[PDB]
Each structure stands twice: as C-alpha cells, then as structure tokens.
Amino acid sequence: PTHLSVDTKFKTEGLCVDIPGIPKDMTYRRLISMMGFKMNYQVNGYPNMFITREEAIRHVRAWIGFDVEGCHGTNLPLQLGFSTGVNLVAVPTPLMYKGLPWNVVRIKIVQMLSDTLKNLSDRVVFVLWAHGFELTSMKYFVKIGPERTCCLCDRRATCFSTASDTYACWHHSIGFDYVYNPFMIDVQQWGFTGNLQSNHDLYCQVHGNAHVASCDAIMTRCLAVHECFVKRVDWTIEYPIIGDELKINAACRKVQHMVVKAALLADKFPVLHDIGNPKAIKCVPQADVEWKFYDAQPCSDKAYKIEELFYSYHSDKFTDGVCLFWNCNVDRYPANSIVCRFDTRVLSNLNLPGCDGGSLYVNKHAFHTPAFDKSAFVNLKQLPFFYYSDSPCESHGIDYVPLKSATCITRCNLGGAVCRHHANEYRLYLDAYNMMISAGFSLWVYKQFDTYNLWNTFT
Ligand SMILES: CN(C)c1ccncc1
Ligand SMILES: [Zn+2]
Ligand SMILES: [Zn+2]
Ligand SMILES: [Zn+2]
C-alpha cells in the first residue's frame, strides 16, 4: 500500500452544487475520467492524480492550496486562486488579475508554480476543498502521462511545452505552458462537518475570508497543515536536504555550547534546569554545575504555559540557578533564562507558512512552531554576539589578515593581540552564528549577562 488506489471511493457530496446529478457512488478512476483525463492502464510511475494523506505529508513542501470560483462553466469566467496569494481570471472566449484566455493563463500558472517550488520540491500537490469547478478546470492547464525526466537535467519533469514538444523540471521551465503530472488531495475526503471557513476558523484567526479564491486556497492549505502537523505529529518522517540544513544544525550545536559555557563561567550558577527535548544531552559536559533535565516535546499548537511546565509540585526551585530553554517555546520565560526561540516570521526554503501565525519548519523533520511573540521575552534581553575560548594559543597545521575585535574573548586579545588560531576559530564561529540567525533562530538571556565577566577567567 504505497499509492492511493484509483478504485478507492470518493465522496461526491461536496461536488453536487457545481456538478448537479453527480453519482453518489464514485471512484478516483471515474472522477479522473470525468475531469477529462485518460490513464490508459499505465504502469509508468504515475498511478493516480490523487494521493494519500501519508504521501501528502511526505511532500508537504509541494503543497499549493488551490480553489476555483465561478465569476459569473464553459460560458462564465473563472477566478483561479492559489495559496501563493495569486488570483487569475480565465475567460473561455491578494494579487488580482483581469480576465484572459486559458492559453495565456496556463503560461502564468507554470511560471508561478516553478518560482514558488523549484527550491522546495520535485513536484506540486494541489490541496483542495473540492466543490467541482477546480477539478473540471484542470484539463485547461494540466497534461498527464508517464513519469519523465527534464530535457536539461536529471530531475523529474513537472512541466510540458506544446511549442517545443519537450518536458522540464521547475528549474528549466521558462516559457513552458502545461503543468505535467501534478498531484492533488481533497481535504473534504477526510470527514468534516460544515464548510471550509467553519473548520478553518476553529484553529486559526490569522487567515480571513476576503471572499476571493486565493483566500479559500490559503484556508484549505492552512487547515490541511493543522490536521497533519498540529493535531497529528509525526517526527519519524524524514525530509530531503534542500539547503543549509547540516550547517544550520551544526551551528546550533556550536552556539548552544558557547553560550551556555559562557553563562556558567560568568555567573557560576550552582544548578542548571534543562527544559525541553527528552533526548537532550549536556551541551557543556565539562561544566561543574548540577545538570537537571525536564522532558518536554516541541509544542506544535500553542506555546507551553510556564505555570504548567514548572508548577504542580526536580529541584522544585526553578528560581535557583539558571533555566535553559533551547527551542522549548513557552508563553513567558522566567528572568533566570538562556533561550533559543525560532522566529516563525523568517523567510526561507526551510520555513513554510503555517497555522494561526505559526510556521512549519522543515529541517530533516517537520516541526510546526507556534507564532513568535516578543512578549515571551519581557524578563530577558537579546543575547549579543561574542566568541569565547580558553583553548591554548597554538596554530597547528587558509590565509591570514590580522583580527581586531572587541568580542573575541581570549587570553591573546586580553594580552593585546589575537593569535592566528583564535582569529580562524572566531571567524568560523561568527559564520556559524550568522547562519543560525539567518535561519530564523533568536537568542535571549538573563539581564545580568555580561561578557566583561569572562575576561577574569584568564588569570
Ligand atoms: C563582578 N560582577 C559585578 C558580576 C559578576 C557576575 N555577574 C554579574 C556581575
Ligand atoms: Zn531540469
Ligand atoms: Zn489559517
Ligand atoms: Zn589565542
């Protein structure tokens, strides 16, 4: 059971207003045929245009919410809305475009999907709240057939050109006019009571209904993300590497060790309360401090209430020493904290739009993160950049320009001249740090944190 059987039943109740008289008894096989597509008993990697919820979750980066609204059905113009915010008007003769024939509309569809998806995925998954017109409009911009490769590279083909009779992936499709072998899923098949807006609004107040097709497209994809990543969480699913994943993850581990090690040296806390991942390991294994772990899985819905994490009777006194919240999203951090909190607003190929202001961060695994809130950090301040090292000044074994920096906290800089080793290590650390910040991570610390207190660890 890898793909969705074409013989699976499709509930058509949601289609009977746009398609009156539709048979109650319906399979994907018959629905695809009714949409104007012929599959010809083809065993060539494309068994069904529709996919399972599990295959959709594996291809979340490909999700594009799609809705079609009747402007006035062969005689009337159609408003095509995408979760990218685009609205196109197709005539049969929040970006709003005036009515144009299908031959040009399809060129715009390929460009939009190629630019949105080339750095995210090898395919498109149209996320629907199917009522009829979206399904019957697909024959105007979609071509299907055997799985193919791009004419300019080894990636699978996602587009087709009637001008050249060739195929292309999202990276090589300039001037292409047809979406080739797209995938789709109808959220309405999952068993919901009531319309799209009533189900979406139960979990999200960020997406409104400005009564246009792209608003419905956005709501559909949001609802789909809520069902698959908020109320249902699967951390076993692995996602391909598409950017700086390994460098970001390595940088996170380097920054964590650096910051915690310096906080322990500067303020000598007798105890550290590590709150978060149940599989966490001591990030500063040589530190003197009493290390105490508290298990909390990543919150994917709302941020944890500090009252529930701490109270209800552990040192019991979290007020003693320091609290470490490394990607443990809480509503209001205590004043004695070291915090790393992912900023959901960050634009990147790893961070996809989420539910209720939250975002879906996809780096090896998928993590829906509650909306970033500046008020969570009222008892803390922003952690400034610094590099600290007590390692011996010794080159061992990359050309050089002398480093001068007030934030290179080393014996050699204390002594008036940064050595080659600490300058190389400083520049590597500054690069790792910048990578982590640009990925969306933000660092916060207790207000008494002062790097001036690190210089006296060189005596
Ligand atoms: C030396 N000094 C005043 C401090 C040491 C550690 N934390 C804060 C202040
Ligand atoms: Zn290509
Ligand atoms: Zn929403
Ligand atoms: Zn040095």
Q: Which residues line ligand 1 (CB under 6 A)?
A: 266-267, 448, 450, 453
Residue 446 is classified by DSSP as E
Looking at this protein, which amino acid is placed at residue 298?
Answer: P
> Ligand 1 test: best mutation among 446, 452, 453, 454, most atoms within 8 Å of CB?
453
Q: Are strands 441-446 and 380-382 parallel, antiparallel or unpaired?
A: antiparallel
Query: Is the Cα dihedral 221, 225, 226, 227 positive or negative?
Result: positive
Distance 267 CA to ligand 1 centre (A): 7
Q: Which residues pair with 142 in a beta bridge?
A: 179
Active site residues: 67, 69, 134, 211, 216
3-state class (DSSP) for residue 453: helix
Nearest listed ligand to the Cα of residue 265: 1
Q: Are strands 166-168 and 125-128 parallel, antiparallel or unpaired?
A: unpaired
d(CA 278, CA 265): 26
231-260 in b/e form (b: 16+ CB < 10 A) is eebeeeeebeeeebbeebeebbebbbebbb
Angle at 301 between CA 296 and CA 306, to 5 degrees: 50
Binding residues for S-adenosyl-L-methionine: 274-280
d(CA 91, CA 74): 9
Nearest listed ligand to the Cα of residue 215: 3
Backbone φ and ψ of 380, nearest 5°? -120, 180
d(CA 83, CA 257): 40
Q: Are strands 271-276 and 178-180 parallel, antiparallel or unpaired?
A: unpaired
Record the resolution, in angstroms: 2.1
Phi-psi domain of 132 (left: phi exceeds 0; alpha: psi -120 through 50; beta: other):
left
Tokens of 197: 């807006």
Beta strands in 99-248 (DSSP E): 100-101, 125-128, 142-143, 159-161, 166-168, 178-180, 183-186
CA quadruple 115, 119, 122, 125: dihedral, nearest 10: -60
Q: How many CA atoms lie within 13 A of 380 on its CB side?
A: 27
3-state class (DSSP) for residue 382: strand
Specify the residue with its C-alpha closest to ligand 1, atom 2: 453
- Contact between 92 and 102 (Cβ < 8 Å): yes
Looking at this protein, which amino acid is placed at residue 357?
Answer: G
CA quadruple 110, 112, 118, 124: dihedral, nearest 10: -70
Tokens of 54: 């599990």
d(CA 258, CA 407): 13
Binding residues: 67, 69, 134, 150, 153, 169, 172, 200, 204, 207, 211, 216, 222, 274-280, 393, 412, 419, 422
Q: How far apart are the first and last CA of the chain?
A: 66
Residue with tokens 């975002």: 359
Residue 24 is classified by DSSP as S
d(CA 50, CA 32): 9
> Residues lining ligand 4 (ion), CB within 5 A?
393, 410, 412, 419, 422
Residue 285 is classified by DSSP as T
Residue with tokens 């290590």: 425
Binding residues for Mg(2+): 67, 69, 134, 211, 216
Closest to 384 measured CA to CA, from 404, 403, 406: 406
Tokens of 110: 């390929």
d(CA 173, CA 107): 10
- Contact between 324 and 338 (Cβ < 8 Å): yes
The H-assigned helical ranges of 84-205 are 102-117, 133-137, 196-200
Closest to 324 measured CA to CA, from 235, 386, 255: 255
d(CA 79, CA 69): 5
> Which ligand 1 atom is at minimum distance from the Cα of 266?
6
Distance 94 CA to ligand 3 centre (A): 15
d(CA 31, CA 39): 12
Distance 413 CA to ligand 1 centre (A): 21
Residue with tokens 């008036």: 416
d(CA 111, CA 107): 6
Cα 159–chain centre separation = 24
Tokens of 136: 């019957």
Q: How many CB atoms lie within 10 A of CB 194?
A: 8
d(CA 364, CA 358): 19
Closest to 48 measured CA to CA, from 141, 148, 167, 182: 182
Q: After which residues is the chain broken (C to N over 2.5 A)?
A: 72, 93, 313, 397
d(CA 199, CA 190): 12
Q: Give the DSSP H or E segment for 30.
A: helix 28-34
Cα 107–chain centre separation = 27
Tokens of 325: 């919240």
Tokens of 337: 């904290």
- Contact between 213 and 78 (Cβ < 8 Å): no
d(CA 394, CA 232): 52
Distance 291 CA to ligand 1 centre (A): 22
Closest to 80 measured CA to CA, from 36, 15, 143, 133: 133
d(CA 323, CA 271): 9
Residue with tokens 């207000």: 447
3-state class (DSSP) for residue 323: strand
Contacts of 410 (CB under 8 A, 6+ apart): 387, 388, 389, 390, 393, 418, 419, 422, 426, 458
Nearest listed ligand to the Cα of residue 209: 3
- Contact between 109 and 179 (Cβ < 8 Å): yes
d(CA 377, CA 341): 10
3-state class (DSSP) for residue 131: coil
Q: How many CA atoms lie within 13 A of 175 on its CB side?
A: 5
> Ligand 1 test: best mutation among 336, 450, 457, most atoms within 8 Å of CB?
450
Q: How many CA atoms lie within 13 A of 26 on its CB side?
A: 19
d(CA 279, CA 365): 15
> Which ligand 1 atom is at minimum distance from the Cα of 456?
1
Determined by X-ray
What is the widest separation between alpha-carbon atoms in the chain?
87
Looking at this protein, which amino acid is placed at residue 344?
Answer: T
Contacts of 455 (CB under 8 A, 6+ apart): 409, 414
Specify the residue with its C-alpha closest to ligand 1, atom 3: 453
Distance 340 CA to ligand 4 centre (A): 28
d(CA 254, CA 262): 12
> Which ligand 1 atom is at minimum distance from the Cα of 448?
8
d(CA 432, CA 35): 51
Residue with tokens 């299907």: 144
Angle at 343 between CA 87 and CA 297, to 5 degrees: 110
Distance 331 CA to ligand 1 centre (A): 28
Contacts of 427 (CB under 8 A, 6+ apart): 403
- Contact between 222 and 204 (Cβ < 8 Å): yes
